[model samples]
Structures are given as C-alpha cells and as structure tokens.
Target: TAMKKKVLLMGKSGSGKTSMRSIIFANYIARDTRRLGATIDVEHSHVRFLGNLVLNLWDCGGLDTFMENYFTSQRDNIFRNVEVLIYVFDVESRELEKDMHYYQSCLEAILQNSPDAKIFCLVHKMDLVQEDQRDLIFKEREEDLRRLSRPLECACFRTSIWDETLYKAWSSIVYQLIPNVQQLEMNLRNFAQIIEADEVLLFERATFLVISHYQCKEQRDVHRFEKISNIIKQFKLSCSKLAASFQSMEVRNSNFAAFIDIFTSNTYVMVVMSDPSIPSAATLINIRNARKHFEKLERV
Candidate 1:
C-alpha cells in the first residue's frame, strides 16, 4: 500500500526542468513546449498516475532571490520526507561555483532531512553539446557527479528535451516509484502462459518504458525490448503526424506471429507466438477480461 510521494524538481535556472516536466507529465510536444514559462517561486501540484499513486511534485525556482529564499526558510519544508529529488543542471552554465554552492547546500540539507531519499542528477541540455564530443563531455561530467552521488545513493542521466533521452530518464524515475513491479511482472508471465504465446511485454503508455516482460521460451537477442520501444515510439509519432492514433498493430512472419494492442488505457501489450493457431478473438477477450484487474492491481 503506497501513498502519495513527494518529488522535488530542483535545479538552476534555464536548465530545462520546466520543459522536461511539461513533456513527461503534461504530454506537451517540445516545439510548442506548452505553458513554457518560469516558475513563480515554487509551483507544487499533484500528478495522479497508476491508480492511487500521486506525485506531489514541487517545481522549485532556480534563480538568485527565489533560490536563496528556497534554501533558508524553505529548505527544511521541501527537503524532509522527500521521496525523490530530481536535480537538473545546465551543462553550459558559466557559474559552476555558484551552481555547485547551491548544489552542496541542497545535497547536505537533503542528506540531513531525507537521509534515504533518492536523488537524480540530470546533466541537461545535451542538444547544445557537439555530437562528436558528447561522449567525452558526458564521461567527464558523469565521472565527477558519480563521486557525489555514490555516497548519497543517487543516480544520474544525460538528458535533452528534444528526443527520447528525456523520456528514458523519466521512465527510470517513474519505475523507481512503482511498489509492485515484480508482482505485475509475475502476472504477465502467467498471462503469457494462459494466452499460449511465446512471450509478452508491458509498457507505460506515456513513456513507453517497459514495466515488465515474460518470455515463454529462450531468445538470443538482448536488444529486442529496446528495439520494440523505439519502433513503437516512432509508430505513435507517425500516428500523431497523420491525425490518427495507434489503436492496434499486428505482425506475422513464417516462424512467428505477434500482436500489439491496448492492454489497459495506460499500457500497450505485445505478444509473440509461434502458434498461429491462437485466435486473436480469444487473445482480445482474455486481455479485456484481464485488463481491469491489472488496473486494479495498481491500487490498494
């Protein structure tokens, strides 16, 4: 039984925290970047997800007076009992000393108040960096950041709002909040067996991050899930392009057949089968009957 979780979105100004928040939570396309503006001090709101899980998100302002106010009177109020702290950094900021000053105070306060809280350092705006040097830049930055995070038990990601990198980072963040990932995974395995399929994969509808999967038989390729994520993302984008949405898709080869369709309103289920004898009608029926339970499983 998980209750509401508080998340702090803390970072320097112009670090794209607002942009990433809009993209991941509000489903805004990057071009328009809907509601693109600076936060007024701290904008905190509840983002409902799964069934009962709500993200009590605190979108804190990352400028001088705003941030100074944040560290003094506001510090303890925001830091304690925090389930997660998503700290973004402007990769090209000239004020490294100032930023790190804020960083040090912030992390120290967080360590004192929420000792077990999870931290995420997002080295952001990767789009501005050179393509060939991206690797070196990330390597150097991550190496340095990892030193700080390792002691605090934090994770890091290199991200940008223009591409799937943002989605991937948020996916990892969301997955860490789910209490029953393994239970849901086990359910998928049993569902695959009952459905007479070779395998099944589950995803979060918004991010397309694999929640869990079950393979009925062995397969050599380890990259299949990553490939599926990219392909389905492209298909969803194409659907948006033509003013349509991807309701369902099917693929068949001589060796195996597969079906992709809505599992829950928030998920897409993919099933592969060597058995062409398996009926689509039956599969759909089983999924429909099972989907509601899956939805319920997300809640208490």
Candidate 2:
C-alpha cells in the first residue's frame, strides 16, 4: 500500500528553504538554485520517496506578512496534520529577536494543531560564516531554539547549500518518515553478519540518500554516509546528462572490497567486505539472492 506524509517547510524570507527543497526534490544544483525566484504564499510539491512513500511538501513563503497570516487566520490550515515541520533560519540574519518571535509564533500554531509533528530547525547559510566560529554560533542558536520550543521537542541541524550538510539534514528528515525502519535495520544486520561484511548501507534509488546503514566495526568519520550521498548524487546527475543511468558499481583494493547493487525496486544496497578471499562474484550473488526477501518486506 502507498503511504503519504505531509511536510511543512517554513522559515523567514530568503532563509534558503527554497534552495534546499529544490536541491533535494528537484535535482537543482547549488548554483542553479540562485536563479530561482522567491516562493509566494505556499507552493505544493509531491515527492515520491522510495517506491510507495510520498511526501506532500508545503513550501510556505516566509515574508513577515505571510508569517503573520499563518499564525492568525490560516493557523489551522497550515499546521494541521503535519508529519514534519522544517524551519530554516539564515545564519547571517541580524534580527535575532524578530526571528525568534516568528519561530515562537510558529511553534504556538503547531502546538495547537499538530502537536505530534516532528520539528526540525535548520541553521542555514553556515558557509557564509567563518569556519572557526560555525560550531559556536550554531550551538548558541540551537540552545535558544530548544529552550523556547518547550513541551514541543525539536532536532537542530547545521546546514549549508554548498556542502553535504543539506543532504545530511534532508536524509535524517526522510529517515523518520519511513515505516518499519527498525525491522529493516534488523534485517540488514542479519544480512551483514551472514555475509561477514564490514558494513552495509541502503540508499534510496532516486535521491541516493542513505536511509539505513549497518557497521560491524567503528569508523572514525561519522559523516561519511552523507558524504557518499553527496558524491553519488553528483555522479549520477552527471551520468544522466549522457542519457545514461547508474545500474551498479564495484570497487576493490587490498584492504577491502565494496559492491553496490540494485536492491528491491526503490533502493540500492552497498555491501563492504574486508575478506578479499571470498571474491566479488559471491557477494553479487548474495545480493541478488536476498533481493526477493527484501522485496517482500517492502511490499508489506
């Protein structure tokens, strides 16, 4: 059965909401997003995620007057039945008090209407800030937002359109919308152990976002998942220019070997193994063999 989720993307004017949304759902590059115009009122987009999961995204315009209208007259229409509320903030905005006030107003509306909706605040345009102070700035902003959020918990992510941070934030938000993820992870772990693989990752076919991952040994860089997402997305985007699509990929070195293959109908599975003796063909066969089980799982 197909499932639909409603996502509300909200923030002040010129806060990078449209940029991020375009990049994630429309495949617009960072430079291309600059050519886009401001979103007036609320723009609706239907994004097909995985195979059956559809995200009904409401990109709400963030002008001050529009913000006021949402809180006053259109509060119910805007806030009701929201699965996720993504609020963007320009890191360089000087009007901190006004930004916080609008945020509080947004939270008030959400509290009254969609109390269970997941709240995500994105500190955008981090690339504009000096590298040395990015963390400090985001930390302070996160603390204030969290305190004001009270009763309604929120997750904060520091993002930049120029880097992998946008994919990281979006991947996390999409992760929460997936159903049966715990079961999917458990099955992935079982598959990993059976194959004696070092790590396993599941990515959405279209977006290349890492939705589920399993690691046998701890790795130093925790951000590698989204980094891979960023890389493969660019790679595939380039391939599509030639009227070609990425099917599967394989890479091997003395230390380990990695295989990425189409799995189920809407995902690509990457399996990494350090034991070079097993050979690549065996892993490929294993991936093909397990496809049936995973397909059935997705069907349910």
Candidate 3:
C-alpha cells in the first residue's frame, strides 16, 4: 500500500491558499460556501483520492506575525513527509516583487528541509489582469523563478478561486502530482451508476445545469444561493417545457427508452449530471448526449 501524499500550501496573506484547498477537498465543487468568506488560522483536512491514496493538506496561515513564531518555529512538523509545496501569490499587488522575495525565504526553509518536494507557484487573481498584460506578468515571473535558482521543479498557473480557470489550473496540478486520479474517476463513475431515476433527473436537468451556468465567467460574482436557486427554478421551467413536448410525441420505442436508461445509468454521466464543473471529456460527452436525447424526444 502506498502512503498518502502530504501537500503544504504556503503563500502571503490573501493569496487564496485556503479557498483553493477547500475546492480540491470537495472534489472541485464549492460544497462549503460559508467557509470561503473569512481568513483565519491554519486548517488541516484529509482529502481521499482513488483507493488508498489521500492528500493530507495543511493550509498554513500567512500573517507576518505568525511567520516566525508559529510557521517557522514548527518547521519540522510543517515540512515533514511533504511531497508537494504550493506557493501562492497575489498577481494584482503592485508590491508583488517584495511579496515574492519574502515568500522565497519560506521556500528556502522548505528546500533545506524537504529537498525532494515539487513546487507549484500559483499566481492568483488572474481574473484581475487585462488580457494584454497577462503575457508580460507570466514572462516576468518565469524570469524571477530562473534567477532564484530554486532546486525543486516548479510550475506556474494563473488562478482565481471564484472562476473555472482556477479549477482548470488545479486539475493540471492534480494530474501531475497525484497518481490515483484514474481510480478517483473510477470510484465516482461507480457511484453514479447506482443512483435512482429521480436522482438522475435531478442531477442531469437541475443540479449540474444550475451549477455550470452560475460558474460561468460572467456570473462568477454572484454568490447568493437565493439567486442561484432562482436560476435553477428557471432551468426546471425549461425542463417542463421540453417534457410537455415529449408527451405530445406520437412515437415511443423500447430502443429510445433503453438509450435513456444506459445514458442515465452511466457513472460518468451521473458525475457530470450532479456537478457540471468536473473537467473530464467523458463527462462533457455525456452532457452533450443527454441534451441531444432530450431534444430528440421533444421534437418527436
């Protein structure tokens, strides 16, 4: 049995280290929305992956006062058995260079203690940058990394906690660092296969549809669940409209019904139906097929 990997998230204050960890622990869906609003002390969570693999994530606090006394003082426990190190940054800050230098001191400590760790530098708040300015920021950061001569292998991502871009960026990181992603997918798929009809319909027509639309770039700022609920209600109305058309159709065949059964019963389909934000191509295909099937029934 392989031991679970330990990931340590380190960064300056307000760099979204906690938010990113929450999203991942919930498998990239914002299940605990209330937890995202405040900044506080270090929090630890164990996130299960495929089979025996798990991620023991330590969300370290970034306050300057706590730096030396708490974080640095506990260097052995903090850096012990660490497999990956995540260094987050606020891209919107004008004092980014100074912040990076300060963060480098922390990184140096990790390097001295955990030499084999993989580093992921997440340049957060990418949504704040203009399209034209992004290239320059990336180039400058690349140069900074090189100048520092950091021993650990590193990768960069422009991430925003409130956007799909963050999930996309993190997915690449998960695939790179976690070996059990395939097993995680398999487990999710199996879970989906066993859900009942009402659950499947709720997942396909209501749950994911509502989540994905709100998750869109334009709607990222809307955090109210009442507002989100209204959007879901509107989606239900659309489904009712399509259902009326399906009832008026003259043809009803076993093949069509069988296809629907297989479509809904698929584990991949169920996962996407429940949470639209999952970034698997198979899940996307399931959504597309479900949409087409609904349209075909409506047209009949």
Candidate 4:
C-alpha cells in the first residue's frame, strides 16, 4: 500500500518547472505564479496519488550553477532510482542550442543512473507564441527532442500553465505510473456493461484527473477528459471558499443521467447512462456494490 515513485523535474532557468508543479499539486492559480520564488538546489515534495501511491517529486533548481552541480557533484544523488524524468523546455527561449545541450547532459545522467525511468519532455509556455505557429513549433520541437534523445525514448507534450494541457500531460503521466491499470480497466468495462452505461470514468478524488475510462458509445470530443479535469478543479476551489467540501454530484437530463460517487478511499467514479427511464437509485446501488471489488484492486 505504501508505493513511492520518484519523479525528477528538470529544465532550464525560468522554464516554468515550478510554476506548473505549483498549479498542479500545490493549488496555485496561473497568475499566482508571480509570488513564488525560485527553487533552491532541489525541492522535494511527496504527493499522495490514489491513497497509497506516493509521488516523490524532485523539482530541480534550474540556474546555471545548479544545473552544472546536478551533472557533476550531485549526479548520482539526483538521478539514482528515478521512476520518471520530466524535462521542461521554454518554447520562447532565445538560446535554443544551449537548452538542447543541457537536455542532452541531463539525459546522459539519467541513462547512467536510472536507465529504466520513463522520460517526458514538456514544451512549456505555448501561450507566449502566436496561435498560428503553435502546431508548427510544437511539431518541430517534438521532432528535435525525439531525435536528440538517442538510445532513450521520450514522450512529448505541449503544456501551458494557462490551459488544460497541463492537466492532460500530468494525467497521462499518472496513467502510466499506475500499476494494474489494465486490470482496473477490465473490471471497469465489465461494471459498465452490467450497468448498461454509455460511458464510465474513474478519477482520483483529490486531483480529479481521469485515471481510466471506458466508452460503450463513441464520443466526438477527445478533449472532454482534460476539460472535465480543469472544470472540476476550479469548482473544487470554489467549494473551499465557502468552507465546504465536494462529496458526490449527479446530473440528469432527458438524454442521459450521470452520477459521481466515492468509489474507493481515494477515487471517484462517474457513470453515464443514456436510458432516461433507468431509476437513479438502481444505478447508485450498482456503484455501491462495485466499490468493494475496486477497493481490493487498489490495495494490490
């Protein structure tokens, strides 16, 4: 139950490493980033994701001096036993060549110390560029990073603190970190089939990040997951202002019925049923019955 995953956060100075970290884990809004100070050598924080899976996040200091230290003196201490390496890049950075050099050095350290670690490259600050150039720039950067990251592969995401892309990236990261996700999805699919649900989603209660989902009916909007993540997080903050906490939510319409309930000690389940005639109480009962089985899966 006490699984701790070490994730290393690395990037150049002013690349929005700590900013996105704050927004995602520390509940800071986009503009609230101005008040945050530069990270020292390394800022270590434990994020409890899904009850027992703790994330040992290392936000590396990005100053030139600190960057050199990481590759040299702090090499082993920084890169050993890492589960994931999330390297960030400022999209509007002027010194692109230097940035790539540093990234390569970081990759070298990771290859030596933690070869099995999954690597992710985030092209941060897409909002600073023009809308027309977003895709072109992102593609170019992704290609370069992929080529430069030789011998080791990396998945890339274009993220901005101002948008839901941050949630999407982190959600994807958490999805891979989760153990037994295939089993979880298989169980969820069976549950959805038994309940005759149009779609089903499982979210981490605190972050509201979609851990897994199954859709009986095809949906047009692929962005729906992150959109819901963004909407619910802001709504969660609204609840705290009034000194209230979010428990369960339900939405019913002529077309469908949606129910969100506590499914596990650290997860929330969202079930969408298209048949309007189905009794809400009946669906709620099904959710209650499935909770025990899902809870057992999380413990393993």
Candidate 5:
C-alpha cells in the first residue's frame, strides 16, 4: 500500500524553517542546489520517501500581516491534510515569552482545525549557541513543554547546513514519518561519524597553531600589530583545516568556508573569548581590523 503524509513547517521569520525545507527538497530530488528567493506566500513541494511514500510539505509564512489574513480565510488550505506539524524556534532569542505566546497561538489554531496532528517542536538555530548554552536551552524548553501537558514528540537538534548534525537529525525525524527507519538511521549515523572525525582533526590542527604561534614565550610577540597578525594566521589556518576536512568528505569547499567564516569573524570570535566584565565594544576596533584583513585575504 502506498502511504502519503502532509507536513506543515511553522516558525517565526529567520528561524530557518524555509532553509530546512529547501535542503530536504534538494536532497530528496537530487538537485544541484536549492535557492531561496522571496517567500511571499506559501511554498509547497512533494518529496518521495523510501520509494513507497510521498510527503507533501507545506512551508508557511509566519509574518504578522500574513498570519492575520491566513488565520481568517486561508486557514483551511494551511490546515488541510496536515498529518504532522513541525514548529521551529530560535534558541538564541531572549524573547522567550513573546515567542512562546506566538507558538501557542499557532498550536491553538492547529488543534481547532486538526486536533489529531502530531506536533514536533524544533529548537532551530542551535548552532548559534555555544555547546554548553545549547544544553541549557534545550533543558528549559523541554521542561516548559512538559509543564504545558503537551506530551510533545520533539527532537532537539543543533542544526547547521555546515554541520552534518543537521542532516542526521533531519533524517531521524523523516524516518519516523516514513518506513525503513533503521536504514535511514544507519546512513545518517555513518555520515555523522565522518563529520565528527573531520571536526576532531581540524580542532587538533587549530590547537597546534595556537600553541606554536601564541603560547610559546619565545615565539610570542608583545607588539600589538604582531599579536594581531598571529591571531589572523591562527584564524586562517583553522579555516583552511576545516575547509580541507569538508572537501575530503566531498562537500563543496566554498560553502563550507562561508559557514565557518561567520563564526571566525573578529566580532564573533571576541564575544566567544570575552572577559565577563568587558563589553563587546572593547574589541570592536580589533574586530574591524580582522574583518579588513580577512577581506583582503579572500580577494587574494
């Protein structure tokens, strides 16, 4: 028997719901790339699973103006045939109360229209938070969901297109929705192991560069310019190592660099390394300088 399922992705703007849908489409369809242009209304795509089932995924817009009109007139289309509801939330936002209220509103609408739909809440953008912070955020959200008596069937994933973790986490959820869960899980696990090994190698390379150039007393220079140069060198070496690692895994090098460069930027790096008492502005100038250096290097 052929099976069919309809899944709706719900989330605030910039929570990565659109990106996730594009990735899944590209992967399932074997497309070279997926482009995300203006998402004016809703985007719908059908993807085949395990050669026996088809999933009709509806990507909905959560913008305020869109929501007002959608809930009133277009609600029927959005709610129609929805077997599973996937809600994505940004983990870094401090506006938890605001987001929670909005999420509840969506849930209320879903319950009214499709009470039996299975709900999956994704803490998206988990890659933006630090490792320790990710655990804390997940814990709080899980507890909150439990308190709401939702009995949510949820999965917490620290997702990034740059990291294989996203694909692995996604495959797990898809398996649950489709048949042949074990096969999908095995493939995802193998891919994740390769990525994890590559990450370890890059970390080791970065550690070596840091120790050789910044830690050793004889090699270390006190001059501000020299210190900054060393820091830039470390950043480039780390980026190169990561790029090479991904390349070995057959992932495109350019995309990998773009993903890592976001965090390697001086501003983000300083925040990651900042003292408890110091404001981020303390390192603003340095970050600007680093950005200039990085731009010049890329041009070369």
Candidate 6:
C-alpha cells in the first residue's frame, strides 16, 4: 500500500513558519535564517520522506494581502486537498484579534475545502517567554485555541526554534503523516528494552530530523534531546568540512554513555543510557544488530 500526504504551512506573516519549514526539511541552519526571504504566494515542492512517502509541502505567505487573495480568489486552490495544516502563532502577538481572525478564517477555509485535514496549532517564539511561565502560558493559549477550533478537534504544541522542542514538535507533526511510523517505533521500543537503554532516536542522516524514537522509561531533563540534536548536527557538518563522513561515535561519562551509528544508508540511530553498567560494546553490538532489521524495514 502507498499513501500521499500534503502539508500546508500556514500562519500570520513572519511567524517563523517558513523558517521552521526550512529548518526541518530544507537543511537550513538556525543562523542561516536571515537568508530566507518571504514566500510570495505559495512555495511548494514534493519532498521525499522515508524514501517513498511524498510530502507535498506548501509554504504560503501569510501577509494580510496574501490571505485576502487566498480567501476570496484562491480558496479552493490553496485550501483544498491538504492532508496536514500546521498553523503557527506568534506568542507575543499584540493584535490577538487580527491573528485569531486569520486563524479562524484559515480553519474555515481548510474545513470548507479539506475538512478532513488534521490541524496543528503551534504557539511559537516561546524562547522569548519566561521559562517557568511557558507551560502555563501555553496551557491558557491552548484552552482558548481549543474553544475556538471546536466542535472541531485540533492538537497543540508550544515550540521554539532555539531548542530540541522544535524537533520534538516537528516529530509529532510528521508522525501524523507517516502511517507506518508506529511500526518503526514499536521496534525501536523493543530494541531499547533489549539493550536496556534510556532512549533511542532515529534521525534522517541528511536532515537530522527525528524520524522515529522511543524514550525509555524516565522523566529526564527535556533539553537534553535538543542538546544532542545540536551537537550531532554540528558534528555532521564538521565531517563534511574534513571531506569525511560521520560513521559512529561513542562517548562515556561518569553518569551516562551514548553511541551513534548508521542505522541505514539514509538514517542514524543514537542510543543513550544512564546506567554505567551497560557496556558500550554491548550497546554497539545492539546497534549493529538492529541495523539490518530497520534496513529491512525500509523496503516494506
């Protein structure tokens, strides 16, 4: 069986919508955001995810002028046939009415043309807010968004471009698009249990986007995930500078150990364990064994 997923990246102008789309799929570094200019009407391309799954991603400009044309002139052209709609909101938005009005209008248009499309509303630029107040702020905003989007259901995520939460939220968004991803997660979870590791994250070798992962039974520090993403992403670039490639890495600390290796020709897997007793050799062996299984997974 085959599936086609179309994603619409929508929100108010300069809401970090295009920046994030570039970050997750276009391999644009955070510092390089200045290079991306505004998307005029809709910039779209067919992106390959998990080899064969085509992500028909539409990056739309959200200026008031653009949206007016979308609502009145290109309603069916823009809103129809969307599989996923990711709408971003600037958390520090002073004009709530204007922003929410566009959100409502976008939702209504999506429902009119693509009623079955899954909706995700992200409150972004969270790094600007107080750390302790983020959850509370996100909670209040979500409650209001939920009321606005219902009797239609919508999922929410609070995201900041500066952290691993960005990858986490993007993972959740793509998770909805990938139908067989649960099967991949099942095996990762099984392999994690077998190795007795704390967590396992599978990343696309090139994009470094989290394709699948299983967080072992712990409520550890959340930022650690993004920390790893930044570290490995930089490491990958460094490899290119040396005209070399990132094959595998092993790091041993007093409290924890981590191992990264090629999971498939196009993917990498990282295993992190806090238990010092689990030998690095054992983890490497576990990774080696899991490689063939996941590669075999890709064909199916």
**Residue 121 lDDT (model 5):** 75
Candidate 2 lDDT tens digits, 148-184? 9989999999999899999899999999999888888
Model 5 lDDT tens row, 43-108: 887765434557788887777676665677888888766788887787766788877877777676
Model 4 lDDT tens row, 156-247: 99999888999999999989988778888899999999999999999988778899999987999998888888887877777877779878
| Global local distance difference test of model 3 | 0.53
Error of 3 at 21 (Å): 1.9
Q: What is the lDDT of residue 235 in candidate 5?
A: 44
- Model 5 TM-score is 0.55
Query: TM per model?
Result: 0.84, 0.96, 0.58, 0.96, 0.55, 0.88
lDDT of 3 by residue, 64-140 (tens): 66556544677788877778888888887678667766667767777777778877788887777897997788778
Specify the poorest-scoring 10-residue window by lDDT in model 5. Answer: 207-216
Q: Give a tens-digit lDDT track for model 6, residues 1-300.
A: 346688888888889988898777776677788678888999987776767467888888988999899898888888888889899999999999999999999889987889899999999999999999999999999999999995568899899877777877777787677767878889889998899888888887766777777886765676665566667877777787768977889787887887888888778888879975665677777788878887876553
RMSD for all candidates, in order, please: 3.1, 1.4, 12.3, 1.4, 17.0, 2.5
Candidate 1 lDDT over 94-208, as tens digits, reads: 9877877787677888878997888888988888898897778877877777775536866878888766667667777877887777788889998888888888989877657
TM-score: the better of candidates 3 and 5: 3
Q: The CA-based lDDT of model 6 is what?
A: 0.82
Residue 55, model 6: lDDT of 83
Displacement of the residue 221 alpha carbon in candidate 2, Å: 0.9
Ranking by TM-score: 2, 4, 6, 1, 3, 5
User: Which ranking of candidates, highest lDDT first?
Assistant: 4, 2, 6, 1, 3, 5
lDDT, candidates in the order shown? 0.79, 0.89, 0.53, 0.90, 0.51, 0.82
Instruction: List pairs with backbone clashes in candidate 1.
Output: none
- Which residue pairs in model 2 clash with each other? none
